[PDB]
Design a protein around this ligand. Sequence first.
Ligand SMILES: OC[C@H]1OC[C@H](O)[C@@H](O)[C@@H]1O
Ligand SMILES: OC[C@H]1OC[C@H](O)[C@@H](O)[C@@H]1O
Ligand SMILES: OC[C@H]1OC[C@H](O)[C@@H](O)[C@@H]1O
Ligand SMILES: OC[C@H]1OC[C@H](O)[C@@H](O)[C@@H]1O
Ligand SMILES: [Mn+2]
Ligand SMILES: [Mn+2]
Ligand SMILES: [Mn+2]
Ligand SMILES: [Mn+2]
Ligand SMILES: [Mn+2]
Ligand SMILES: [Mn+2]
Ligand SMILES: [Mn+2]
Ligand SMILES: [Mn+2]
Lengths: 387, 387, 387, 387
Amino acid sequence: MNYQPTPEDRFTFGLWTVGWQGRDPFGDATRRALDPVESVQRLAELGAHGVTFHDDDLIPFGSSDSEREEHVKRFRQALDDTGMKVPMATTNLFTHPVFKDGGFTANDRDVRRYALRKTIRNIDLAVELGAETYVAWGGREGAESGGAKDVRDALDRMKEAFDLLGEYVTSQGYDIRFAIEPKPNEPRGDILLPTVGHALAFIERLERPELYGVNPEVGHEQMAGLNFPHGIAQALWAGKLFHIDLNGQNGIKYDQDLRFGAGDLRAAFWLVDLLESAGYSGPRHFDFKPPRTEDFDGVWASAAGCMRNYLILKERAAAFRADPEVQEALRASRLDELARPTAADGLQALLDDRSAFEEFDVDAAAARGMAFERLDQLAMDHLLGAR
Amino acid sequence: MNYQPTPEDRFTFGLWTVGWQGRDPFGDATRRALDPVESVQRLAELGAHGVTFHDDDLIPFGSSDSEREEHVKRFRQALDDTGMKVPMATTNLFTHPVFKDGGFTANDRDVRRYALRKTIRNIDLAVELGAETYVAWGGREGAESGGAKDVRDALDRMKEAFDLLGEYVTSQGYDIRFAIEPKPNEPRGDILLPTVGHALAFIERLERPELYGVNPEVGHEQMAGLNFPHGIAQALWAGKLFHIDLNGQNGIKYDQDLRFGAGDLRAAFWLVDLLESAGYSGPRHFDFKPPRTEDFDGVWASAAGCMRNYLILKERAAAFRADPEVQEALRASRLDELARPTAADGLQALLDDRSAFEEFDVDAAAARGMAFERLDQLAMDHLLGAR
Amino acid sequence: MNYQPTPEDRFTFGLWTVGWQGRDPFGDATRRALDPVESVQRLAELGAHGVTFHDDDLIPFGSSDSEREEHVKRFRQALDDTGMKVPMATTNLFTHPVFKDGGFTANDRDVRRYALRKTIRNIDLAVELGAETYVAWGGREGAESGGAKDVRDALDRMKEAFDLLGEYVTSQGYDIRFAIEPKPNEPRGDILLPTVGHALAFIERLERPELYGVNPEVGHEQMAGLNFPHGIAQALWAGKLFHIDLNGQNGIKYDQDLRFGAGDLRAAFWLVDLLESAGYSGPRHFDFKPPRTEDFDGVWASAAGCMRNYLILKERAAAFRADPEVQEALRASRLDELARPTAADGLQALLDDRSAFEEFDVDAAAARGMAFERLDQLAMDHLLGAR
Amino acid sequence: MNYQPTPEDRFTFGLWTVGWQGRDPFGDATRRALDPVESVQRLAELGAHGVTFHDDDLIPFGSSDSEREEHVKRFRQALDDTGMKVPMATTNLFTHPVFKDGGFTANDRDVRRYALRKTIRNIDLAVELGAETYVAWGGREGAESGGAKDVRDALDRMKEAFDLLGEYVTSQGYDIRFAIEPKPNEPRGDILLPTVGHALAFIERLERPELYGVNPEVGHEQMAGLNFPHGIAQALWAGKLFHIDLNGQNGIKYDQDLRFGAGDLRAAFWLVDLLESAGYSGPRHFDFKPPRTEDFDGVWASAAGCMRNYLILKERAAAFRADPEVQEALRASRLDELARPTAADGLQALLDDRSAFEEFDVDAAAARGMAFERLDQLAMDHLLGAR
Ligand SMILES: OC[C@H]1OC[C@H](O)[C@@H](O)[C@@H]1O
Ligand SMILES: OC[C@H]1OC[C@H](O)[C@@H](O)[C@@H]1O
Ligand SMILES: OC[C@H]1OC[C@H](O)[C@@H](O)[C@@H]1O
Ligand SMILES: OC[C@H]1OC[C@H](O)[C@@H](O)[C@@H]1O
Ligand SMILES: [Mn+2]
Ligand SMILES: [Mn+2]
Ligand SMILES: [Mn+2]
Ligand SMILES: [Mn+2]
Ligand SMILES: [Mn+2]
Ligand SMILES: [Mn+2]
Ligand SMILES: [Mn+2]
Ligand SMILES: [Mn+2]
């Protein structure tokens, strides 16, 4: 009881994750810059299935079109040498000072045109490399002060940018979908579409909604004090869980990005319970930063523990759902009754049913216990291996 | 410079607001129970336009159908004597112990049938009394522990309950819409559809979405650390701001419900700026609790300051938008450019525009300042009357 | 692997905990009122060591002095019949409407005199029943608005109240100490001495500081987003961990009071690691509320899981500290070096040590990894039983 | 009604504030690097009284001792040319990768020796330049994971470091005090002494406590959801408000550092009310970052609005306290009674006073209203200039 990943677990990492050199808003870098080749080799050794990338993780901002190709060719060699895939790719529209007021909602209209052209060039690459999902994190879309952004106009510009992306993909015939990744704040004071629910809502107003879903990340819902497995339940109920970012976060503070398992560990248990019982079948992607305390040995430790923690919690969630005593408890708590329709008899029948009101014994019903605490300690004893 | 409401400002209060007897989770009541008649009289004197009610604020839980009528008739007299309206009404599906695991998503299916029948009886009343909007706050829909609620099944039950309400209203021919009011937590650990964005998303999956919008409340988005005027911008951009609850809240903690102005005062300025410049024309409804320190004189003080603060902030937001120097600033900050389409030239033109990429000077563009701090102190000097 | 408490584990519960009838700020009670006798019997059966009480949990507010005695005598019988102890007692200065603006810092001076007399009468009882610690939670000391409380004057009144308590105990010859329990907010907007650190600071200004320590509670530091085991480390470093309240809390929201283990489970692991390795030897007291979903079977389940979770986490923290690989890791991470003095050579030696500055190789030192991620996955594999 | 600072308002800025080049954890710098000379000139023109500095803001890390002197001499010239003072100085023990696990509590003992020697060299400079206060922000003292730092050992190392600093200052005969600046988190997961209350407590355990106070910052208490004017009240009640950092923050999130007034504006009103009515007479120091949207014109706008907002709020707090109606209200609310001793009659008299218990009419007393809402709208109408 040992927990060894293989490439079939679908574990992926961004280049920026094991590649983060530990430069924070108060500190210089503490690690040198990894070659993308490197990282591909090391990650394949650890059992990973693939990697993801921003355009500028792969090709240095500014690159000519003969360096560009060079970068790509090296990359491609390493994937072919290791068997690693590239399921997902994304654009950096945050680093470069030109992005300081956003990329698709920046007040300057020339910036907003340049954000779309940067994006479209990388969609073509991603498609080349075989990615299925193209993520958009608008981390610079938002404001520090209430008169600097009209939000209605800015959502109009964001819808315009996603609609022209949708056009371009369907005009090229590409098989690629888009996944918006919410974040509530940081590095802007407030970030537009700050949660999964605001990103799901916004999708429903694009021209082609079936092209877009979400990429929620553990630590960014938690940065609003929200229940991340409830978030993901709703995204699954909408049909829009295209991709996920897995990692940890200790409560409402700056975005920590700790390895997956760290943070809220019970939330991580019920998230694995839910992905595996809903049958999510996209990549289990880790968007994490190895703390800057760490050297490169710490880096590969940290990326391994991500995968380990995922497999342990999988095993404990599967044994919980398999346990007859737990399935008895779930009946005692009437989760079987939550899955049945309230009134499949229809409205008229409901309205003529005296047992539904006139002759409903409210006291007898209020007196029933829900038996949730016994059910939740069962879940505790399963996660701790006490069962 | 004086700020006197009239019934044309559309100011409304819930019965439960000035009626709250100050019973908290650690303390007994500190004020006796007001007659609904009372409150109607006192509120009309203060300049209010109307009141709102839960079924059980008006008619005591349990009431026969000859007390029921009695209650209603008294009520009706007071409205006719004062000219007060009833724009909005709502159901109590939280107080009574039968609701302890929810009303439309309670695990027991009999409870869920009884929640719908209670609801439908009050829709008929509301319609009688002339309300235009029927609010649903599911404050007991949610969980304290992750195995006690399957969220996918529970959203299925919530959609079923709202769809049968929609059926019933359109079968009766009623002119009534529904407004879901999010809250992230309290009194459940976590509450389903915790934010405006999750409530907007959920709406898009009902059978008749055009019947449903939102009733956001200041202090409940703030309980997630979210920017309430950005929330309301998005609800306005979706066409779904049916009703609002106005009040204050100091940050991420239990739901304070302070009078409107208290709390985040700058957030209250940019919320009034936005309602009045978007032309919101529903009720300005105050969902607040006069602190339990207060006697009944404190109560009517507190409900007056709600209205005052709203009028002061209206005047300061109007003088800010009217000020030529502020309109110069907003051009300096390129809010005029945020309102223009990014690419009304279309995708092909964008892609053949060299000035959009190949010949876009990114340094010159990154060098421009956005001039937001000068713009935001203008907004500060306007709100403080320093202008 | 089974985890059975005994009275030697020092497990205690307040009467108010298993006794909470589930009345919340939106809902009526869902359970009838337990006799204190009852609770003493049931808790002894579960393995508990004792109970604690507010004056008004035991004797009904208002009680004559012949009911008073009656109450006490019954109580006393049950303790003698079960062997249960009463290590800690406390005053209700929150419920009764007279307390609405506080008890020792209420603006009315007559209230403040009545708070002290209520307190002193219960210190005499507590002493009768054998308690060693007298807790003070000033849950109504604080304000909703900034002009309603001058905080300097209020800390003067709080110091005056604690100094006269100290006088009274040392004039009576009682062996009793006091423990202040911080809470940051709820039911007041803001509560004075909101954290362990503000309560430790305040102690240092009383006349007899050696009489006072703290009673921190898991969920109340977490309500400020603070690291509860770091809090308790500091209280232990000051010599002031007199008593503790154990329970759970999911982040920054209203005070949930979930059973102990729920909430932040990793925080609960490092808190047990720290109490047991520092050798805390007071009561392990559970200040929790069985959710109002629950019937009385749910109640006793919930109070059992408190104790279970504590024993499981004890075992996992002991196996982590006992593991040779973990003790190697802790050397790799230089926790051995953190325990050594920086400069026991003294200031002059430090200043003449060239290896400390002039000839300190800062790059070589920055290059060392701290090896914390490998150390923290070891801790994860120990808590999950994966080791 | 105009609000013009002069050098007598005691307004100071850190070099790092107007000097921040806008490099964030997702973005490059958006402004070039200001010469310290520059900033001194520009700030004197705006009305400032002085500046503050980290060692490494002034002299580039690594500097020889002939560049060192050069740096200092230029600096000195600009102060002499403008009349600017240097009231406060501080050490950078956060940037350099050697600091990645802290400076005075870093696990490596050699680091901790090098942190103290860096510190002591800058105390000598500060003393040269005339500073009265030496701040310590331990922004890298803390941990991301619970086994990486034993907090008891780390507080022992922090006390050792502050005690040897105290020794060195009193051995040199310097007139300099120390001010610890709390922060709850960022850039570490958790930061030791996270609040004012934990920093006040810790002080009481140093060898010479009278040498140390606090430097609270608005936005860092707010990052715990705490009431910053209550914090500062307690620091004033302890005699330990040595210095302050003024700025804004919108709630519990990453450290924004917005100009002073932005953020919680009502909290800023009651903080100015309190500093000016307590007669705080240290520097009003602004620790803020001009957002990275801004060019250098935005920079000097932002630093001006800091000072403006402070003067406006001063005027509004003075007119509130001067208003007879407000002084009537404060009597109605019994703030006069909060300032009187509870029992200056002594314990025995309290205990023999029947009017204090046996014959205390609790109902009559609970029935009194506190009249706080009328008092708080008066405060609202004063801050908005509506009065
Ligand atoms: O999508 C791009 C990635 O870009 C950087 C963000 O910090 C991270 O959340 C994200 O997933
Ligand atoms: O909608 C009903 C009202 O019910 C009680 C809730 O606490 C309040 O938020 C709400 O607006
Ligand atoms: O100290 C008395 C007890 O009183 C009730 C409080 O809610 C709880 O935190 C506390 O421990
Ligand atoms: O004390 C030094 C200064 O150092 C940088 C910190 O971010 C700031 O809070 C502080 O005041
Ligand atoms: Mn993140
Ligand atoms: Mn991410
Ligand atoms: Mn509310
Ligand atoms: Mn509401
Ligand atoms: Mn609690
Ligand atoms: Mn407690
Ligand atoms: Mn700061
Ligand atoms: Mn600071």
